[PDB]
Amino acid sequence: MTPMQQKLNEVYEAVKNYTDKRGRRLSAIFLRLPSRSELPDYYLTIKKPMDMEKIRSHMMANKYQDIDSMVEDFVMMFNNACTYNEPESLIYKDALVLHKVLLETRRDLE
Numbered sequence: 001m002t003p004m005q006q007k008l009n010e011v012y013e014a015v016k017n018y019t020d021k022r023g024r025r026l027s028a029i030f031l032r033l034p035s036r037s038e039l040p041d042y043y044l045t046i047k048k049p050m051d052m053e054k055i056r057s058h059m060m061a062n063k064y065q066d067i068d069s070m071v072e073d074f075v076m077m078f079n080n081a082c083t084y085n086e087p088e089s090l091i092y093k094d095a096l097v098l099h100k101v102l103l104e105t106r107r108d109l110e
């Protein structure tokens with residue numbers, strides 16, 4: 001695997017694997033967004049749906065030319081979560097924390 005592919009897998013795994021101070025894996029809610037059949041209202045609040053399974057499949061299909069492209073999908077996903085849920089909710093706070101982890105991970109790989 002190229003250094004580019006190694007950095008992509010590392011960024012993805014940092015987000016996926018992060019746990020909080022009590023061991024809770026924050027990424028669990030962001031793996032699979034329910035379909036529009038199951039969750040119509042989300043697809044009207046949210047222009048471009050995104051979840052980690054989609055990011056993972058783009059990564060296995062090498063569709064990421066650089067790291068910036070992967071971060072954009074992650075930031076899109078976390079912005080989506082912070083649009084659909086209110087700031088006081090757990091999912092909003094989990095999105096904010098994983099967003100910070102994402103950027104700190106990209107920075108550490110600079």
Ligand SMILES: CC(C)(C)OC(=O)N1CCN(c2cc(-c3ccccc3O)nnc2N)CC1
Pocket residue numbers: 029030031032033034038039050051052077080081082084085091
């Ligand atoms: C019972 C039924 C009505 C089907 O609802 C559910 O099963 N839900 C579970 C998922 N849930 C949410 C997912 C995301 C989310 C997921 C992946 C990526 C980004 C995201 O924002 N965000 N906010 C939510 N609150 C919506 C409600």
